[PDB]
Amino acid sequence: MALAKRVVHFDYDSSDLSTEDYQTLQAHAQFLMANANSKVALTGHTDERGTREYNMALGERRAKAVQNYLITSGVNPQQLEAVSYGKEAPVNPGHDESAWKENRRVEINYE
Numbered sequence: 001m002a003l004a005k006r007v008v009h010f011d012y013d014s015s016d017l018s019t020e021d022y023q024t025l026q027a028h029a030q031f032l033m034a035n036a037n038s039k040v041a042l043t044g045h046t047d048e049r050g051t052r053e054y055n056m057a058l059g060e061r062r063a064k065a066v067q068n069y070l071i072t073s074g075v076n077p078q079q080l081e082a083v084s085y086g087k088e089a090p091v092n093p094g095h096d097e098s099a100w101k102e103n104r105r106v107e108i109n110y111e
């Protein structure tokens with residue numbers, strides 16, 4: 001079940017991971033260590049609030065926060081990619097809170 005989750009979320013202007021996101025990440029860490037040839041692309045995103053520049057950096061910190069946890073957990077840095085899309089690729093349009101909660105995220109994409 002933990003492995004079924006391919007996205008973790010963040011609070012406003014934060015790159016801190018929640019206790020729930022950590023459970024998810026531990027599952028992927030174990031899978032990646034057992035599958036040394038599996039590779040993952042981590043994409044960081046933000047909600048539409050703020051400049052494009054500000055959010056590109058925030059998205060990058062989010063992706064790297066996830067990357068660093070996996071690495072600390074034992075995942076080979078070679079199996080990981082960390083990139084930011086800033087506020088350019090929201091999953092939910094509309095300009096409201098709930099929607100922004102969905103957009104503050106890092107997606108885990110297996111190659």
Ligand SMILES: N[C@H](CCC[C@H](N)C(=O)O)C(=O)O
Nearest residue numbers: 012013014046047049050104
């Ligand atoms: N200092 C920025 C924070 C934006 C945070 C939001 N884009 C997020 O995705 O967490 C502002 O005044 O909008």
